[PDB]
Scaffold this active site. Structure first.
Site, short mmCIF file in Angstrom:
data_model
loop_
_atom_site.label_atom_id
_atom_site.label_comp_id
_atom_site.label_asym_id
_atom_site.label_seq_id
_atom_site.Cartn_x
_atom_site.Cartn_y
_atom_site.Cartn_z
CG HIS B 85 -2.19 -0.76 0.98
ND1 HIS B 85 -3.30 -0.65 1.79
CD2 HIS B 85 -2.51 -1.67 0.03
CE1 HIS B 85 -4.24 -1.47 1.36
NE2 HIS B 85 -3.79 -2.09 0.29
CG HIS B 247 -4.60 -11.45 -2.69
ND1 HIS B 247 -5.67 -11.01 -3.44
CD2 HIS B 247 -4.20 -10.39 -1.94
CE1 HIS B 247 -5.92 -9.74 -3.15
NE2 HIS B 247 -5.04 -9.34 -2.25
CD1 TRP B 298 -7.70 -14.50 -1.86
CD2 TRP B 298 -6.44 -13.73 -0.18
NE1 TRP B 298 -7.95 -13.15 -1.74
CE2 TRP B 298 -7.19 -12.65 -0.71
CE3 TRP B 298 -5.57 -13.48 0.89
CZ2 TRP B 298 -7.09 -11.37 -0.22
CZ3 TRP B 298 -5.48 -12.22 1.38
CH2 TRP B 298 -6.23 -11.16 0.82
C1 HEM Z 1 -6.69 -6.00 -7.40
C2 HEM Z 1 -5.82 -5.54 -6.55
C3 HEM Z 1 -5.95 -5.87 -5.13
C4 HEM Z 1 -7.05 -5.82 -4.40
C5 HEM Z 1 -8.39 -5.38 -4.90
C6 HEM Z 1 -6.71 -6.21 -3.12
C7 HEM Z 1 -7.62 -6.25 -2.08
C8 HEM Z 1 -7.30 -6.64 -0.81
C9 HEM Z 1 -8.10 -6.57 0.29
C10 HEM Z 1 -9.50 -6.04 0.38
C11 HEM Z 1 -7.45 -7.05 1.31
C12 HEM Z 1 -8.04 -7.22 2.68
C13 HEM Z 1 -7.99 -6.02 3.59
C14 HEM Z 1 -8.26 -6.39 5.01
O1 HEM Z 1 -9.36 -6.42 5.52
O2 HEM Z 1 -7.35 -6.65 5.72
C15 HEM Z 1 -6.24 -7.49 0.87
C16 HEM Z 1 -5.33 -8.09 1.66
C17 HEM Z 1 -4.04 -8.27 1.25
N1 HEM Z 1 -3.51 -7.93 0.05
FE1 HEM Z 1 -4.40 -7.25 -1.45
N2 HEM Z 1 -5.41 -6.45 -3.09
C18 HEM Z 1 -4.88 -6.30 -4.26
C19 HEM Z 1 -3.57 -6.47 -4.64
C20 HEM Z 1 -2.53 -6.79 -3.80
C21 HEM Z 1 -1.17 -6.69 -4.04
C22 HEM Z 1 -0.51 -6.15 -5.28
C23 HEM Z 1 -0.52 -7.17 -2.94
C24 HEM Z 1 0.93 -7.26 -2.72
C25 HEM Z 1 1.80 -7.53 -3.65
C26 HEM Z 1 -1.49 -7.56 -2.03
C27 HEM Z 1 -1.25 -8.13 -0.82
C28 HEM Z 1 -2.24 -8.29 0.12
C29 HEM Z 1 -1.95 -8.87 1.40
C30 HEM Z 1 -0.62 -9.40 1.89
C31 HEM Z 1 -3.04 -8.84 2.12
C32 HEM Z 1 -3.05 -9.42 3.52
C33 HEM Z 1 -3.37 -8.63 4.76
C34 HEM Z 1 -3.11 -9.40 6.03
O3 HEM Z 1 -2.79 -10.55 5.97
O4 HEM Z 1 -3.23 -8.91 7.15
N3 HEM Z 1 -2.69 -7.30 -2.58
N4 HEM Z 1 -6.13 -7.17 -0.44
#
Ligand code: HEM
Ligand code: HEM
Ligand code: NA
Lengths: 717, 717
Positions: B85, B247, B298
């Site tokens: 982010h 993810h 996931w």
């Molecule tokens: C289409 C693009 C993406 C969307 C729409 C998306 C959406 C989301 C959302 C909604 C969450 C959950 C938020 C929460 O309640 O904690 C999430 C979690 C996460 N996203 Fe994404 N994301 C995207 C791309 C990416 C990218 C590019 C990365 C990193 C390279 C990433 C890594 C993560 C990770 C690591 C979490 C985990 C949070 C945790 O474990 O506490 N995402 N994403």
């Protein structure tokens, strides 16, 4: 309500409208100053030929320019109003406003409705500024133009000091809560004026020339005049002298309909080159000029100093009437004195006129007896006016050391909060070092020493450069009974003790070396800091610059110093009643008056907590295990996620911070916790809270401490 | 509507809502920086123990804190989201956003809806910052915590570069006009996102995780994913690599209803210490956490790198369901895979879920093609995610000289706009002298030489630190064909001559000294300015730092360079179609991107005009009678009250300045006239237009010119 690009004023305030604005701690950034860091204006003014400058201003005053033709062929009176308005924004509640930074050439002042037509006034002075360059600030030039105009027209002024340094960015000042020009949301009860304001409407200098809210009651208007002028440091004599002296000259401008007067300069289109109020009545200038809307020529000699004003005022009876723009003004009953008042451009003579506020000088009892006297004694008028005009134009100058040039009379003036001159020799190192030791043996706690020292120096406000530790005025009234100074406890005992070492060093004086009590206060806090730093493993020396002098109650205008009393001082965790904003906004406000940066405030707050500087030695924010030790503990503990903070049950504006066991471990004010809560303060806190930060915190604390001790010390820079 | 205290955000913007904001030219001023003036972050990180930094970060990732317990006993996934982010605010249109300044710790970004729960994430790493202090910026740590998280869980990253310098004041960026969080007012046409934006809604990183406007349609979501990720420099392969690799880790959070989540950090009470989104749902954390309000896990291996994500995506059929907070998500059909998926805190085991935007990787024809390939060959996924994550975390670092430390890989990357190593000895003082004289004998005019040099060097923008004169890309596509660089005529003439001089110098040089084309472009303008300063009676030497090298077309990504094309350059009086604001707001934005101060900006316009730098050599603003002469005539004439300014009758954005005869003497644009109209800028013009100002003008103009030529020159810094 849409968001804008940063370059259009958008930013984080749009999302969080009442958030802490740290930008008040970097007013006038150096990036924006076109002059070098090495630019030395004092050195520049020293080289100015003041006679040549006066001559060149004289030539401007009598060379009429086609784009704003000169009334009676003399811009003098316009320039006097210009100067009077430049100085006339001053207010004693915060010492803001006044002519000292030349703020009239920047927003919002350059576009206040009362500053109408002064865009052309300042513009006429460009040929002068062009010739003297960096040797003459606009700030000096605007008031010095008024002074010269006075002299050019037959009035001998008391003098002038140069030295107002130009700034490059508007001073951000609260002028009122009203989002409407001329608006009035500032009164309450029967004419109680909202602090810290010194004007009756938004964008007015003092009062409404048509009387309060447009009601031309000279008796009522006098209530406003007296009150607004007193908030600008002028008593009844000073006020009456200033008005009479002012309106001895020139004219008002209200030849036609005011709805033919275009937008004010900040809103005008680019092709007008910074000017505004462009007008479609007539030629828009000269004989057709419109400024206030009123059309009054007070005297028959508008370009000469005489006693016409008080003779016309007393020599006629006064009828209410209307300017050619629908404004209330007074004129003579019975058609008396027809055609006796000369026209600015050769037209027929006119009748006598006055402002509603002019008749106040004759209707109000206190003003009436002052001015009736001057009707038979113009030499008294001329005298009180020079003293008041000089005071008006130099109110925000600071200590007399700041006055520059060959036109400063040496005479002592009580309103300058005078300080005796250095008479004897000054303590050197050996002596200074000695006295630190005796002060340390005095029996005064680091809390006592630091808190007293902070109490003297922190009395300074950079707005008008009053207050500070020079003078020794902490042992004098009123400073000595200030609730924040808490005379209740050890203020006396520290004063009494500290004078004893004055004597002991003096009565056993080695030769001609003497110490002021003003210096021992500052040296005390200095030596305590040295002690509290060795208690924390750091052998260091705090700088101390001697040269302060004592001062007597007789040279300390008690009521003038009333306004310098803190209603709040977060650096001692003090918060009295009556403050306009929550305690964290008053923290930032106080730091701005102290000329402090955001990092300087931070390190100062952290240091002072762990030293004991708190009002009544309160524990709020004292986040250290150690007693009178100089650590960064405040920052480290503020960042300790092991502590959970919750508002105190008792609604004190106190908070408790508990450990894992739920036992209360810390308490703090809002002032304390804003440094852990504000995203930008916490950034600073984290600098000083890290493992490798203790020597840097101390170094930075000392330099900022020395900065507050030296605030008023223009005698040595 | 009401006016507020400056400490509570009051100012002149409130009275004149759409006025120029010169505060954009002093972002992050030195007075607000708590480090000393001698501070050099590059020097500090260069000496960090990376191995020990990694262990301490690994130590934090597996050490759960009671105030935010770690899913699966491992903060690693949370830190990946944090890093993604931080960098994920970057957009190509103006180079702003991204992780380079650590802006996520400051408003508004720390309070973005999409950044919920990151307040705690950043908080968890205070023990690391605390330990390394000034050796380690928040910016470097935030993005490095994510990179460490990856390798901790089985993914070997490509490398990492330290060097992000911490700031103290939020970079003010335009994020859209919407005054409502998650508001959408940024599409016209058929789904065309407004430039410069790169998110579909206000406070989203990129796209809505429940599909466009909450329509959980994978195929349509895909179009948003594609376009926002394109405006963040990511093509189809990089985007799918990023989402899959991302993810592969952790989970989303929505254990309860979202209206039990308190205010975001900048609206939260003081006791919460910078943490926002306090939740009254259950314990408000951990098993009860509410970040997004979606409740998807996931993979069945949230804390380990493998191919589970694509196996799950393709091994199930999906159907639409609602999370406990009622957000759209997908889950496996026919109760398949029930219990196969571990819970973050103990927990009964749960069944497969994906987001609507995850299904896009399978439903959209282009993504499916990519992601199917990686289902069948997951080694290929590991590579593309390594490249794309590295690009992501470093996109705004600028030239590769800024990458510091032992984890910096040595390979050249086209997206870094690479530049050759210096292969020979660089020119010394004699060679530089001789070459300057050869350029002056060449036939090229002062106008041509200054224009070319300015065109090459002013392509730098300090947002993402892309562009500049190094690389010699002004002679390559696309810069050689940009409208503002006006290749219809002189540019290729100029390029040919400097190449001929480079060839003839190199073929006859002493020893192994050689000179690059890229250096000669800049040298040429330096030589032109010395010649013109002499014609105006000054003998200045314009400094010059050799050591630029020549990129080739193959090392120059034509498409990536398109975002650097100026659609407005006030320094050349160029204004294309399609700029967001009037010309004077674009001038400031260009100055801001060049890192110029208001004084530096003012001196360059003045100099460039009389030097002849104007696009197409138009006379707008050329307020001088002298050819090729470096005088201050622009400021003198701008301030000339004998000229009367009116908008041109042809309504063409120009203005006519007439003298007394009524004859048109000068012409100018909004950019020219804004220096005579804006009250802050006119103040600066009055400095450089004084009688004594002319040597100061030459000196500061040369200094600012030098600053602009060296903007990209981190190889010597
Ligand atoms: C289409 C693009 C993406 C969307 C729409 C998306 C959406 C989301 C959302 C909604 C969450 C959950 C938020 C929460 O309640 O904690 C999430 C979690 C996460 N996203 Fe994404 N994301 C995207 C791309 C990416 C990218 C590019 C990365 C990193 C390279 C990433 C890594 C993560 C990770 C690591 C979490 C985990 C949070 C945790 O474990 O506490 N995402 N994403
Ligand atoms: C209650 C106090 C005062 C009131 C209500 C007041 C009001 C006014 C007004 C409304 C005008 C008309 C402006 C125009 O239309 O051109 C004016 C003009 C003027 N004022 Fe006063 N003023 C006050 C105090 C002073 C003081 C203290 C001074 C100087 C010490 C001063 C000096 C002047 C001068 C010289 C002019 C004439 C300017 C010219 O000839 O263009 N005023 N005043
Ligand atoms: Na008179």
């Amino acid at each position: 309500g849409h968001m804008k690009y940063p370059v259009e004023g958008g930013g984080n305030q749009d999302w969080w409208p009442n958030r802490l604005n740290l930008k008040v701690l970097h007013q006038n950034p150096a990036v924006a100053d076109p002059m070098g860091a090495a630019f030395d204006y004092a050195a520049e003014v020293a080289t100015i030929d003041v006679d040549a400058l006066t001559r060149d201003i004289e030539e401007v005053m009598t060379t009429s320019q086609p784009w704003w033709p000169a009334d009676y062929g003399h811009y003098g009176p316009l320039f006097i109003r210009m100067a009077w308005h430049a100085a006339g924004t001053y207010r004693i509640h915060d010492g803001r406003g006044g002519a000292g930074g030349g703020m009239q050439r920047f927003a919002p002042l350059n576009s206040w409705p009362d500053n109408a037509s002064l865009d052309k006034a300042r513009r006429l002075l460009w040929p002068v500024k062009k010739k003297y360059g960096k040797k003459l600030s606009w700030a000096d030039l605007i008031v010095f133009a008024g002074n010269c105009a006075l002299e050019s027209m037959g009035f001998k002024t008391f003098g002038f000091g140069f030295g107002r340094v130009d700034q490059w960015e508007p001073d951000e000042v609260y002028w009122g809560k009203e989002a409407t020009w001329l608006g009035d949301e500032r009164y309450s009860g029967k004419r109680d004026l909202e602090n810290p304001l010194a004007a009756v409407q938004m964008g007015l200098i003092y009062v409404n020339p048509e009387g309060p809210n447009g009601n031309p009651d000279p008796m009522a208007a006098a209530v406003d005049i007296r009150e607004t002028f007193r908030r600008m440091a002028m008593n009844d004599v000073e006020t009456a002298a200033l008005i009479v002296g002012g309106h001895t000259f020139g004219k008002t401008h209200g030849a036609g309909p005011a709805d033919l007067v275009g937008p004010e300069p900040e809103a005008a289109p680019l092709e007008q080159m910074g000017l505004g109020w462009k007008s479609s009545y007539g030629t828009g200038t000269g004989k057709d000029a419109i400024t206030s809307g009123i059309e009054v020529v007070w005297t028959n000699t508008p370009t000469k100093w005489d006693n016409s004003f008080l003779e016309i005022l007393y020599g006629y009876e006064w009828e209410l009437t209307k300017s050619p723009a629908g404004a209330w003004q007074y004129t003579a009953k019975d058609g008396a004195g027809a055609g006796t008042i000369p026209d600015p451009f050769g037209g027929p003579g006119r009748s006598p006129t006055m402002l509603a506020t002019d008749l106040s000088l004759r209707v109000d009892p206190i003003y009436e007896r002052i001015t009736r006297r001057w009707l038979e004694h113009p030499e008294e008028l001329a005298d009180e006016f020079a003293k008041a005009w000089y005071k008006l134009i130099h109110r925000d100058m600071g200590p007399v050391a700041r006055y520059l040039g060959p036109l400063v009379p040496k005479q002592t003036l009580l309103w300058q909060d005078p300080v005796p001159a250095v008479s004897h020799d000054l303590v050197g190192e050996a002596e200074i070092a000695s006295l630190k030791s005796q002060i340390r043996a005095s029996g005064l706690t680091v809390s006592q020493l630091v808190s007293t020292a902070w109490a003297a120096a922190s009395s300074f406000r950079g707005s008008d450069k009053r207050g500070g530790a020079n003078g020794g005025r902490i042992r004098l009234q009123p400073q000595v009974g200030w609730e924040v100074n808490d005379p209740d406890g050890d203020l006396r005992k520290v004063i009494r003790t500290l004078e004893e070492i004055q004597e002991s060093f003096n009565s056993a004086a080695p030769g001609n070396i003497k110490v002021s009590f003003a210096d021992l206060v500052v040296l005390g806090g200095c030596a305590a800091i040295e002690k509290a730093a060795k208690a924390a493993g750091h052998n260091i020396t705090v700088p101390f610059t001697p040269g302060r002098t004592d001062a007597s109650q007789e040279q300390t205008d008690v009521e003038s110093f009333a306004v310098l009393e803190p209603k709040a001082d977060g650096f001692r965790n003090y918060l009295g009643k009556g403050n306009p904003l929550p305690a964290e906004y008053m923290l930032l406000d106080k730091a701005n008056l102290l000329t402090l940066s955001a990092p300087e405030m931070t390190v100062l707050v952290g240091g002072l907590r762990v030293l004991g500087a708190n009002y009544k030695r309160l524990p709020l924010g004292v986040f250290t295990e150690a007693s009178e030790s100089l650590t960064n503990d405040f920052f480290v503990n503020l960042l300790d996620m092991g502590i959970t903070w919750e508002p105190s049950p008792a609604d004190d504006g106190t908070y408790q911070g508990k450990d894992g066991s739920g036992k209360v471990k810390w308490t703090g004010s809002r002032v304390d916790l804003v440094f852990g809560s504000n995203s930008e303060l916490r950034a600073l806190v984290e600098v000083y809270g890290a493992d490798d930060a203790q020597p840097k915190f101390v170094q930075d604390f000392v330099a900022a401490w020395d900065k507050v001790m030296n605030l008023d010390r223009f005698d040595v820079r």
